[PDB]
Coordinates of C-alpha atoms in Angstrom, one line a residue:
Chain A
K1126 CA -26.6 12.1 37.7
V1127 CA -24.2 10.5 40.2
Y1128 CA -20.4 10.5 41.0
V1129 CA -18.3 7.6 40.0
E1130 CA -14.6 7.4 41.0
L1131 CA -12.0 5.0 39.6
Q1132 CA -8.9 4.0 41.6
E1133 CA -6.1 1.8 40.4
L1134 CA -3.7 -0.2 42.5
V1135 CA -0.4 1.6 41.8
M1136 CA 3.0 2.2 43.5
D1137 CA 4.7 5.5 44.1
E1138 CA 8.3 6.3 43.1
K1139 CA 9.7 8.0 46.2
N1140 CA 9.1 5.1 48.5
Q1141 CA 8.1 2.2 46.1
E1142 CA 5.0 1.6 48.2
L1143 CA 1.9 0.3 46.7
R1144 CA -1.4 2.2 47.3
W1145 CA -4.6 3.2 45.7
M1146 CA -4.6 6.4 43.5
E1147 CA -7.6 7.7 41.7
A1148 CA -7.3 7.6 37.9
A1149 CA -10.6 9.0 36.6
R1150 CA -13.9 10.3 37.8
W1151 CA -17.4 10.6 36.3
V1152 CA -20.1 13.1 37.0
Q1153 CA -22.0 12.2 33.8
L1154 CA -18.8 13.2 32.0
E1155 CA -15.4 11.6 32.4
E1156 CA -12.3 13.4 33.7
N1157 CA -8.9 11.8 33.9
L1158 CA -5.9 12.6 36.2
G1159 CA -2.6 13.3 34.4
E1160 CA 1.0 12.6 35.4
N1161 CA 1.4 16.3 36.1
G1162 CA -1.3 16.0 38.8
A1163 CA -4.2 18.0 37.3
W1164 CA -7.5 16.7 35.9
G1165 CA -8.0 16.7 32.1
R1166 CA -10.9 18.3 30.3
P1167 CA -14.2 16.6 30.7
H1168 CA -15.2 14.3 27.9
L1169 CA -17.8 11.7 26.8
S1170 CA -16.6 8.2 27.7
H1171 CA -15.5 6.0 24.8
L1172 CA -14.6 2.3 25.4
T1173 CA -12.4 -0.2 23.8
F1174 CA -13.9 -3.4 22.4
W1175 CA -11.7 -5.6 24.6
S1176 CA -12.7 -3.7 27.8
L1177 CA -16.4 -4.4 27.2
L1178 CA -15.8 -8.0 26.2
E1179 CA -13.8 -8.6 29.4
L1180 CA -16.2 -6.7 31.6
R1181 CA -19.0 -8.9 30.2
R1182 CA -16.9 -12.1 30.8
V1183 CA -16.1 -11.2 34.4
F1184 CA -19.7 -10.0 35.1
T1185 CA -21.4 -13.2 33.9
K1186 CA -19.6 -15.2 36.6
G1187 CA -19.3 -12.2 38.9
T1188 CA -19.7 -12.1 42.7
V1189 CA -22.6 -9.8 43.7
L1190 CA -23.3 -8.6 47.3
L1191 CA -26.6 -6.9 47.0
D1192 CA -28.2 -5.0 49.9
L1193 CA -25.1 -5.6 52.0
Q1194 CA -25.3 -4.4 55.6
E1195 CA -21.8 -2.9 55.8
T1196 CA -20.8 0.7 56.4
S1197 CA -17.0 0.3 56.2
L1198 CA -14.4 -0.5 53.5
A1199 CA -13.0 -3.2 55.8
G1200 CA -16.4 -4.8 56.3
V1201 CA -17.2 -4.7 52.6
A1202 CA -13.7 -6.1 51.8
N1203 CA -14.1 -9.0 54.3
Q1204 CA -17.6 -9.9 53.1
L1205 CA -16.5 -9.7 49.4
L1206 CA -13.4 -11.9 50.0
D1207 CA -15.5 -14.4 52.0
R1208 CA -18.0 -14.6 49.0
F1209 CA -15.1 -14.8 46.6
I1210 CA -13.8 -17.9 48.4
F1211 CA -17.3 -19.3 48.7
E1212 CA -17.9 -19.1 44.9
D1213 CA -14.4 -20.4 44.1
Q1214 CA -13.4 -17.1 42.6
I1215 CA -10.2 -16.9 44.7
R1216 CA -8.3 -19.3 46.9
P1217 CA -8.2 -19.2 50.7
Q1218 CA -4.4 -18.6 50.6
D1219 CA -5.1 -15.4 48.5
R1220 CA -7.4 -13.9 51.1
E1221 CA -4.7 -12.3 53.4
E1222 CA -2.9 -10.7 50.5
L1223 CA -6.1 -9.4 48.9
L1224 CA -7.4 -8.0 52.2
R1225 CA -4.0 -6.3 52.7
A1226 CA -4.3 -4.8 49.2
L1227 CA -7.9 -3.6 49.5
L1228 CA -7.4 -1.8 52.8
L1229 CA -4.3 0.0 51.6
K1230 CA -4.1 3.8 51.7
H1231 CA -6.4 5.5 49.1
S1232 CA -4.5 8.5 47.8
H1233 CA -5.9 11.3 45.6
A1234 CA -4.7 14.1 43.4
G1235 CA -3.9 16.4 46.3
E1236 CA -1.0 14.0 47.4
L1237 CA 0.3 13.1 44.0
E1238 CA 2.8 16.0 44.1
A1239 CA 3.4 15.2 47.8
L1240 CA 4.7 11.9 46.5
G1241 CA 7.1 11.4 43.6
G1242 CA 4.5 10.3 41.2
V1243 CA 2.9 6.8 40.7
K1244 CA 3.8 3.9 38.5
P1245 CA 1.9 0.8 37.4
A1246 CA 2.1 -1.9 40.0
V1247 CA 1.3 -5.6 40.2
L1248 CA 0.5 -7.2 43.6
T1249 CA 2.8 -10.2 44.2
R1250 CA 2.4 -13.3 46.3
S1251 CA 4.5 -11.8 49.1
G1252 CA 4.0 -8.4 50.7
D1253 CA 6.2 -6.7 48.1
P1254 CA 5.1 -5.1 44.8
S1255 CA 6.4 -6.3 41.5
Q1256 CA 6.6 -4.6 38.1
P1257 CA 4.3 -5.6 35.2
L1258 CA 5.7 -8.1 32.7
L1259 CA 3.4 -7.3 29.8
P1260 CA 4.3 -4.2 27.7
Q1261 CA 2.8 -0.9 28.9
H1262 CA 0.3 1.1 27.0
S1263 CA 0.0 4.8 27.9
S1264 CA -3.7 5.7 28.3
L1265 CA -5.4 7.2 25.3
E1266 CA -7.5 9.5 27.6
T1267 CA -4.4 10.8 29.4
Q1268 CA -2.6 11.5 26.1
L1269 CA -5.7 13.3 24.5
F1270 CA -7.3 15.2 27.3
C1271 CA -4.8 15.5 30.2
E1272 CA -1.7 16.7 28.3
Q1273 CA -2.6 20.4 28.6
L1274 CA -17.6 18.8 41.5
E1275 CA -20.2 21.5 42.0
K1276 CA -22.4 19.6 39.5
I1277 CA -22.6 16.7 41.9
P1278 CA -26.2 16.9 43.2
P1279 CA -26.7 17.4 47.0
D1280 CA -28.9 14.2 47.2
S1281 CA -26.6 11.9 45.2
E1282 CA -24.7 8.7 46.0
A1283 CA -21.3 7.7 44.8
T1284 CA -19.8 4.6 43.2
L1285 CA -16.2 3.4 43.9
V1286 CA -14.4 1.3 41.2
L1287 CA -11.2 -0.5 42.3
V1288 CA -9.0 -2.1 39.7
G1289 CA -5.8 -3.9 40.7
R1290 CA -3.4 -6.5 39.2
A1291 CA -2.4 -9.5 41.3
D1292 CA -0.4 -12.2 39.5
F1293 CA -1.4 -14.9 42.1
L1294 CA -4.9 -15.2 40.6
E1295 CA -6.0 -17.9 38.2
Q1296 CA -8.6 -15.6 36.4
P1297 CA -9.9 -12.1 36.6
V1298 CA -12.7 -11.7 39.2
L1299 CA -15.4 -9.0 39.4
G1300 CA -17.0 -8.2 42.8
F1301 CA -20.2 -6.0 42.8
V1302 CA -21.5 -4.6 46.0
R1303 CA -24.7 -2.6 46.8
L1304 CA -24.8 -1.3 50.3
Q1305 CA -28.1 -1.4 52.2
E1306 CA -27.4 2.1 53.4
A1307 CA -25.1 4.5 51.5
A1308 CA -22.2 5.3 53.7
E1309 CA -19.1 7.5 53.4
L1310 CA -15.8 5.6 53.3
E1311 CA -12.2 6.4 53.9
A1312 CA -11.4 5.6 50.3
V1313 CA -13.4 8.5 48.8
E1314 CA -12.4 12.0 49.7
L1315 CA -15.5 13.8 48.4
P1316 CA -18.3 14.1 51.0
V1317 CA -20.7 11.9 49.0
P1318 CA -22.0 8.6 50.4
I1319 CA -21.1 5.4 48.5
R1320 CA -23.8 3.1 47.4
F1321 CA -22.1 0.8 44.9
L1322 CA -18.6 -0.8 44.8
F1323 CA -16.9 -2.3 41.8
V1324 CA -13.9 -4.5 42.5
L1325 CA -11.9 -5.8 39.5
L1326 CA -8.9 -8.0 40.4
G1327 CA -6.9 -10.3 38.3
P1328 CA -3.5 -11.3 36.8
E1329 CA -1.7 -9.9 33.7
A1330 CA -3.5 -11.3 30.7
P1331 CA -3.6 -10.4 27.0
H1332 CA -6.5 -8.2 25.8
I1333 CA -7.2 -7.1 29.4
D1334 CA -6.2 -3.6 30.4
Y1335 CA -7.5 -3.1 33.9
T1336 CA -7.6 0.6 33.6
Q1337 CA -9.8 0.3 30.6
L1338 CA -11.8 -2.4 32.5
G1339 CA -12.4 0.1 35.3
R1340 CA -13.3 2.7 32.7
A1341 CA -15.9 0.4 31.2
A1342 CA -17.4 -0.5 34.6
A1343 CA -17.5 3.2 35.6
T1344 CA -19.1 4.2 32.3
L1345 CA -21.7 1.4 32.8
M1346 CA -22.4 2.7 36.3
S1347 CA -22.6 6.3 35.0
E1348 CA -25.3 5.2 32.5
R1349 CA -28.8 6.0 33.9
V1350 CA -30.6 2.9 32.7
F1351 CA -28.0 0.5 34.2
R1352 CA -27.9 2.6 37.4
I1353 CA -31.7 2.4 37.8
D1354 CA -31.5 -1.3 37.2
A1355 CA -28.7 -1.6 39.7
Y1356 CA -30.7 0.0 42.4
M1357 CA -33.6 -2.4 41.7
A1358 CA -31.4 -5.4 41.1
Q1359 CA -32.3 -8.4 43.3
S1360 CA -29.9 -10.9 41.6
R1361 CA -26.9 -11.1 39.3
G1362 CA -29.3 -12.0 36.5
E1363 CA -30.9 -8.6 36.4
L1364 CA -27.5 -6.9 36.3
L1365 CA -26.5 -9.2 33.5
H1366 CA -29.6 -8.4 31.6
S1367 CA -29.0 -4.6 32.0
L1368 CA -25.4 -5.2 30.8
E1369 CA -26.7 -7.1 27.8
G1370 CA -29.0 -4.2 26.9
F1371 CA -26.1 -1.8 27.4
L1372 CA -24.1 -3.8 24.9
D1373 CA -27.1 -4.1 22.6
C1374 CA -27.4 -0.4 22.3
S1375 CA -23.7 0.3 22.0
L1376 CA -22.2 1.5 18.7
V1377 CA -18.8 0.1 17.5
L1378 CA -16.7 2.3 15.2
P1379 CA -14.2 0.2 13.1
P1380 CA -10.8 1.6 12.1
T1381 CA -10.7 3.5 8.8
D1382 CA -7.9 5.1 6.7
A1383 CA -10.0 8.1 5.6
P1384 CA -12.1 9.4 8.4
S1385 CA -14.5 12.2 7.6
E1386 CA -17.2 14.0 9.7
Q1387 CA -19.7 13.8 6.8
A1388 CA -19.5 10.0 6.9
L1389 CA -19.4 10.0 10.7
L1390 CA -22.5 12.3 10.9
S1391 CA -24.4 9.7 8.9
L1392 CA -24.4 7.6 12.1
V1393 CA -26.6 10.2 13.8
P1394 CA -29.8 8.2 13.1
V1395 CA -28.1 5.1 14.3
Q1396 CA -27.1 6.7 17.6
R1397 CA -30.6 8.2 18.1
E1398 CA -32.2 4.8 17.5
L1399 CA -29.8 3.0 19.9
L1400 CA -30.5 5.6 22.6
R1401 CA -34.3 5.2 22.0
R1402 CA -33.9 1.4 22.3
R1403 CA -31.9 1.8 25.5
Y1404 CA -34.5 4.1 27.1
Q1405 CA -37.6 2.3 25.9
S1406 CA -37.3 -0.3 28.7
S1407 CA -36.2 1.9 31.6
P1408 CA -38.6 3.9 33.8
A1409 CA -36.4 6.9 32.9
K1410 CA -36.6 9.2 29.9
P1411 CA -33.6 10.6 27.9
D1412 CA -32.3 14.0 29.0
Chain B
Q1322 CA -13.7 -48.7 2.4
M1323 CA -13.7 -50.1 5.9
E1324 CA -11.3 -47.5 7.2
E1325 CA -12.6 -44.1 8.2
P1326 CA -9.5 -42.0 9.1
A1327 CA -9.7 -39.0 11.4
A1328 CA -8.2 -35.7 10.4
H1329 CA -4.6 -35.2 11.5
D1330 CA -3.9 -31.6 12.7
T1331 CA -0.4 -31.3 11.2
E1332 CA 1.2 -28.4 9.3
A1333 CA 4.6 -30.0 8.9
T1334 CA 4.5 -29.3 5.1
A1335 CA 2.4 -26.2 5.2
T1336 CA 5.4 -24.0 4.0
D1337 CA 5.7 -26.1 0.9
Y1338 CA 2.5 -24.4 -0.4
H1339 CA 3.5 -20.8 0.5
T1340 CA 3.9 -19.0 -2.8
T1341 CA 6.8 -16.6 -3.4
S1342 CA 4.6 -14.2 -5.4
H1343 CA 4.2 -10.8 -3.7
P1344 CA 0.5 -9.9 -3.9
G1345 CA -0.5 -6.7 -5.6
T1346 CA -2.3 -3.8 -4.0
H1347 CA -6.0 -3.9 -4.8
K1348 CA -8.9 -1.8 -3.7
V1349 CA -11.8 -3.9 -2.6
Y1350 CA -15.5 -4.1 -3.7
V1351 CA -17.5 -6.0 -1.1
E1352 CA -21.0 -7.4 -1.7
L1353 CA -23.1 -9.1 1.0
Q1354 CA -25.7 -11.7 -0.2
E1355 CA -28.4 -13.3 1.9
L1356 CA -30.3 -16.5 1.5
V1357 CA -33.9 -15.5 0.7
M1358 CA -37.1 -16.8 -0.8
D1359 CA -39.3 -15.1 -3.4
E1360 CA -43.1 -15.1 -3.2
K1361 CA -43.6 -15.7 -6.9
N1362 CA -42.0 -19.2 -7.0
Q1363 CA -41.0 -20.0 -3.4
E1364 CA -37.5 -20.7 -4.7
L1365 CA -34.5 -20.4 -2.5
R1366 CA -32.0 -17.9 -4.0
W1367 CA -29.1 -15.6 -3.0
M1368 CA -30.0 -11.9 -3.0
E1369 CA -27.7 -8.9 -2.8
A1370 CA -28.2 -7.1 0.5
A1371 CA -25.5 -4.5 0.9
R1372 CA -22.4 -3.4 -0.9
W1373 CA -19.1 -1.6 0.1
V1374 CA -17.2 0.7 -2.2
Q1375 CA -16.1 3.5 0.1
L1376 CA -19.1 3.6 2.4
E1377 CA -22.0 1.1 2.9
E1378 CA -25.2 1.0 0.8
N1379 CA -28.0 -1.2 1.8
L1380 CA -30.8 -2.5 -0.5
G1381 CA -34.3 -1.6 0.8
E1382 CA -37.6 -3.5 0.5
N1383 CA -38.4 -1.5 -2.6
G1384 CA -35.5 -2.7 -4.8
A1385 CA -33.7 0.6 -4.4
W1386 CA -30.4 1.3 -2.7
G1387 CA -30.3 3.4 0.4
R1388 CA -28.2 6.3 1.5
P1389 CA -24.4 5.7 1.7
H1390 CA -23.3 5.5 5.3
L1391 CA -20.3 4.8 7.4
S1392 CA -20.1 1.1 8.4
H1393 CA -21.1 0.9 12.1
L1394 CA -21.0 -2.5 13.8
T1395 CA -22.8 -4.1 16.7
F1396 CA -20.8 -5.5 19.6
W1397 CA -22.3 -8.9 19.2
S1398 CA -21.4 -9.0 15.5
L1399 CA -17.7 -8.5 16.2
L1400 CA -17.8 -10.9 19.2
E1401 CA -19.4 -13.7 17.2
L1402 CA -17.2 -13.0 14.2
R1403 CA -14.1 -13.4 16.3
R1404 CA -15.6 -16.6 17.8
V1405 CA -16.3 -18.2 14.3
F1406 CA -13.0 -16.9 12.9
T1407 CA -11.1 -18.6 15.6
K1408 CA -12.5 -21.9 14.5
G1409 CA -12.6 -20.8 10.8
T1410 CA -11.9 -22.8 7.8
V1411 CA -9.5 -21.1 5.4
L1412 CA -8.6 -21.9 1.7
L1413 CA -5.7 -19.5 0.8
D1414 CA -4.5 -19.4 -2.8
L1415 CA -7.3 -21.6 -4.0
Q1416 CA -7.0 -22.5 -7.7
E1417 CA -10.7 -22.4 -8.7
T1418 CA -12.4 -20.5 -11.5
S1419 CA -16.1 -21.3 -10.8
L1420 CA -18.4 -21.0 -7.8
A1421 CA -19.0 -24.8 -8.0
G1422 CA -15.3 -25.5 -7.6
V1423 CA -14.9 -23.1 -4.7
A1424 CA -18.0 -24.5 -3.0
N1425 CA -16.9 -28.1 -3.4
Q1426 CA -13.4 -27.4 -2.1
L1427 CA -14.8 -25.4 0.8
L1428 CA -17.2 -28.2 1.8
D1429 CA -14.4 -30.8 1.5
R1430 CA -12.3 -28.7 3.9
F1431 CA -15.4 -28.2 6.1
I1432 CA -15.8 -31.9 6.4
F1433 CA -12.0 -32.4 6.9
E1434 CA -12.1 -29.9 9.8
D1435 CA -15.3 -31.5 11.3
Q1436 CA -17.1 -28.2 10.9
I1437 CA -20.1 -29.9 9.2
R1438 CA -21.3 -33.5 9.1
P1439 CA -21.1 -35.6 5.9
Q1440 CA -24.9 -35.6 5.8
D1441 CA -24.9 -31.7 5.7
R1442 CA -22.7 -31.5 2.7
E1443 CA -25.2 -32.1 -0.1
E1444 CA -27.7 -29.7 1.3
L1445 CA -25.0 -27.1 1.9
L1446 CA -23.8 -27.6 -1.7
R1447 CA -27.3 -27.1 -3.0
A1448 CA -27.7 -23.9 -1.0
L1449 CA -24.3 -22.5 -2.1
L1450 CA -25.0 -23.2 -5.8
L1451 CA -28.4 -21.6 -5.9
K1452 CA -29.0 -18.6 -8.2
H1453 CA -27.5 -15.3 -7.2
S1454 CA -29.9 -12.6 -8.1
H1455 CA -29.2 -8.8 -8.0
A1456 CA -31.2 -5.7 -7.3
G1457 CA -32.4 -5.3 -10.9
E1458 CA -34.3 -8.5 -10.8
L1459 CA -36.0 -7.8 -7.5
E1460 CA -38.9 -5.9 -9.1
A1461 CA -39.4 -8.8 -11.6
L1462 CA -39.4 -11.4 -8.7
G1463 CA -42.3 -9.7 -6.8
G1464 CA -40.4 -9.1 -3.5
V1465 CA -38.2 -11.2 -1.3
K1466 CA -38.4 -12.5 2.2
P1467 CA -35.7 -14.0 4.5
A1468 CA -35.5 -17.8 4.4
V1469 CA -33.9 -20.5 6.5
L1470 CA -32.2 -23.5 4.9
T1471 CA -33.7 -26.9 6.0
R1472 CA -32.4 -30.3 5.2
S1473 CA -35.1 -31.7 2.9
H1474 CA -38.3 -7.9 11.7
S1475 CA -36.5 -5.5 9.3
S1476 CA -32.9 -4.7 9.9
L1477 CA -31.6 -1.5 11.4
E1478 CA -29.8 -0.3 8.3
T1479 CA -32.8 -0.8 6.1
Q1480 CA -35.0 1.1 8.7
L1481 CA -32.6 4.0 9.0
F1482 CA -31.2 4.4 5.5
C1483 CA -33.5 2.7 2.9
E1484 CA -37.0 3.9 3.8
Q1485 CA -36.7 7.2 1.8
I1486 CA -21.0 2.1 -9.0
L1487 CA -18.6 1.4 -11.8
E1488 CA -17.8 5.1 -11.8
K1489 CA -16.8 5.0 -8.1
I1490 CA -14.9 1.6 -8.2
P1491 CA -11.2 2.0 -8.9
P1492 CA -9.9 0.3 -12.0
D1493 CA -7.6 -2.4 -10.5
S1494 CA -10.1 -3.5 -7.9
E1495 CA -11.1 -7.0 -6.9
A1496 CA -14.3 -8.2 -5.4
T1497 CA -15.1 -9.8 -2.0
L1498 CA -18.3 -11.9 -1.8
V1499 CA -19.8 -12.5 1.6
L1500 CA -22.4 -15.3 1.7
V1501 CA -24.7 -15.4 4.7
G1502 CA -27.4 -17.9 5.5
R1503 CA -29.2 -19.7 8.3
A1504 CA -29.2 -23.5 8.2
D1505 CA -31.2 -25.1 11.0
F1506 CA -29.6 -28.5 10.5
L1507 CA -26.1 -27.3 11.4
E1508 CA -24.8 -27.9 15.0
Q1509 CA -22.7 -24.7 15.1
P1510 CA -22.1 -21.6 13.0
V1511 CA -19.3 -22.1 10.5
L1512 CA -17.0 -19.6 8.8
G1513 CA -15.4 -20.1 5.4
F1514 CA -12.7 -17.8 4.2
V1515 CA -11.4 -18.3 0.6
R1516 CA -8.7 -16.3 -1.1
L1517 CA -8.4 -17.4 -4.8
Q1518 CA -5.0 -17.9 -6.4
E1519 CA -6.1 -15.3 -8.9
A1520 CA -9.2 -13.1 -9.3
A1521 CA -11.9 -14.8 -11.3
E1522 CA -15.2 -13.8 -13.0
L1523 CA -17.5 -16.4 -11.7
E1524 CA -20.4 -17.0 -14.1
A1525 CA -22.6 -18.0 -11.1
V1526 CA -22.2 -14.6 -9.4
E1527 CA -21.7 -11.8 -11.9
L1528 CA -20.1 -8.7 -10.2
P1529 CA -18.6 -5.5 -11.6
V1530 CA -15.1 -6.7 -10.7
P1531 CA -13.5 -10.2 -10.5
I1532 CA -13.9 -12.0 -7.2
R1533 CA -10.8 -12.6 -5.1
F1534 CA -12.2 -13.4 -1.6
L1535 CA -15.2 -15.4 -0.5
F1536 CA -16.8 -15.2 3.0
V1537 CA -19.2 -18.0 3.8
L1538 CA -21.2 -17.7 7.1
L1539 CA -23.8 -20.4 7.8
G1540 CA -25.3 -21.7 11.0
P1541 CA -28.4 -22.3 13.1
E1542 CA -30.5 -19.9 15.1
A1543 CA -28.3 -19.1 18.2
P1544 CA -28.6 -16.3 20.7
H1545 CA -26.8 -13.0 19.9
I1546 CA -26.1 -14.2 16.4
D1547 CA -27.6 -12.0 13.6
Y1548 CA -26.1 -13.4 10.5
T1549 CA -26.8 -10.2 8.5
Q1550 CA -24.8 -8.3 11.1
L1551 CA -22.1 -11.0 11.0
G1552 CA -21.9 -10.5 7.3
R1553 CA -21.7 -6.8 7.7
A1554 CA -18.9 -7.2 10.2
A1555 CA -17.0 -9.4 7.7
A1556 CA -17.6 -7.0 4.9
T1557 CA -16.4 -4.0 7.0
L1558 CA -13.3 -6.1 8.0
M1559 CA -12.6 -6.7 4.3
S1560 CA -13.2 -3.0 3.5
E1561 CA -10.5 -1.9 6.0
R1562 CA -7.0 -1.4 4.4
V1563 CA -4.8 -3.1 7.0
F1564 CA -6.9 -6.2 7.2
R1565 CA -7.3 -6.3 3.4
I1566 CA -3.5 -6.2 3.0
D1567 CA -3.0 -8.9 5.6
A1568 CA -5.7 -11.0 3.9
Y1569 CA -3.8 -10.7 0.7
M1570 CA -0.6 -11.7 2.5
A1571 CA -2.0 -14.3 4.8
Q1572 CA -0.8 -17.9 4.6
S1573 CA -2.5 -19.4 7.6
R1574 CA -5.6 -18.7 9.8
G1575 CA -3.3 -17.4 12.5
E1576 CA -2.3 -14.3 10.5
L1577 CA -5.9 -13.6 9.7
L1578 CA -6.7 -13.9 13.5
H1579 CA -3.9 -11.6 14.4
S1580 CA -5.1 -9.0 11.8
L1581 CA -8.7 -9.3 13.2
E1582 CA -7.4 -8.8 16.7
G1583 CA -5.5 -5.7 15.7
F1584 CA -8.7 -4.5 14.0
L1585 CA -10.6 -5.0 17.3
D1586 CA -7.7 -3.2 19.1
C1587 CA -8.3 -0.2 16.8
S1588 CA -12.1 -0.4 17.2
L1589 CA -13.9 2.2 19.3
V1590 CA -17.2 1.6 21.1
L1591 CA -19.6 4.5 21.7
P1592 CA -21.9 3.5 24.6
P1593 CA -25.5 4.7 24.6
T1594 CA -25.2 8.3 25.8
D1595 CA -27.8 10.9 26.6
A1596 CA -25.9 13.6 24.7
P1597 CA -27.1 15.2 21.4
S1598 CA -26.2 13.1 18.5
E1599 CA -23.9 15.5 16.7
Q1600 CA -21.8 16.2 19.7
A1601 CA -21.7 12.5 20.7
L1602 CA -20.5 11.5 17.2
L1603 CA -18.0 14.4 16.9
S1604 CA -16.4 13.5 20.2
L1605 CA -15.2 10.3 18.5
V1606 CA -13.0 12.2 16.0
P1607 CA -9.9 13.1 18.1
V1608 CA -10.1 9.8 20.0
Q1609 CA -10.3 7.8 16.8
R1610 CA -7.5 9.9 15.3
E1611 CA -5.2 9.2 18.3
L1612 CA -6.2 5.5 18.2
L1613 CA -5.4 5.1 14.5
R1614 CA -2.3 7.3 14.5
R1615 CA 0.1 4.3 14.0
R1616 CA -2.2 1.8 12.3
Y1617 CA -1.9 3.4 8.8
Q1618 CA 1.8 4.4 8.9

């Protein structure tokens, strides 16, 4: 089991300065950070349909930097932006703004009360942050679990997931990085080296909630089959195949007007069969 | 004649056909039928595969219905259902009383919308007007195997629920028929959605309740397209109250697409998790309750 941290590009209220603030963390269970400043109860990760659809869409044409010889957030950011421009994911005029955004201060829960709280933020063409234009949706996880680290193994490696909204982008863009040597970065406070980096940038678009996109990416990284495939991935095709299997073994629950546990517990064999299908291909065995 | 006009995408007089009758509230019975071949005669026929009353029952390969279960969907089923519904062909308030009339009007609209070629129409009409057999006749037919329509592994639900009606159906209930088949001569998958002007007892397809809606899902073998799962997704869509209300009140394809997108907004995905099954399922109860808090208000 590994540690996955999700940070969202947000702006504070006391200075109106945009920075990175952690929104959720995974050590095989998901925890979320509330507006009060404390972590909610741990819970199993549940994903929206649109988050997984968009994650697949941005992954299929995603920019992958496997076995990258970088040991700094600045170096990873520079290499990722160069490969973004190389693959026509972004434009060369966007590089300066995206580099300024990626290297911003990464804040954590211990300084949320030191600030005046954080607000959703969109990175604008200039050096100033704007406010989102689309209607806001308060996170389901924060409403359900928040309104109320010793399990990290000593020989584990971390994953950092960065989600940000920048209106000066034609399309959402996914950047996946696997470092050659797991290194500790200034972004992550916990003394665990980072092996993987997820970077999700894009403009405001319908059916795309970047917090849920980062939740889907972090849940994918927290899955053992995909993580083992990600360590062994030599190309974007293998990661895509692992994502396809992850979606193959997913279970979609439609809305209903009369939910009951007796009907829901009838899906126990389906969940068991999907888990068995997921683990039949991996070297690992279900825990 | 010499002229071969192209379809004109115009809805300038669409509101001239929007009825002023407020639709009534009906509970739904959904039946999924699949295009199959029987070993006794090698005859193509439509066979009942699953039905929806309150839960889902699937028909096993013994002619007996399986355990009732909650309707789970695959991710690919909903993705491809949205894809084919975006380009879907709709016939809303269709004044037909036979399956032949519905099929002919649907194929005419298919050709008008360039969904199928004019050389596909006769074979599709033959397929849609085949015999619709039901579970009682399965023993007399000596089994049934899936078939693919030509121009000339077992399913998860059966594996997990089938290996081992009129009392339940509410009185003022109308039927939804979902027809699913594979046609190797089609270029792309096509969706047909039909809401009849009034419910009808089609002599071609006898059902416990009159048919109001028809789902037609045909297409070739394409990746990530399981037509049985696509039919199950359409049936679960019709079984849900909000989409059913919108489908009764829909006047264009856009309203149906908006309802389907809201349905997907309120859909929750459980990833493959290593947790025990009962805890993994029961973790979905408060999340789904908070997600559906405003949908049914």
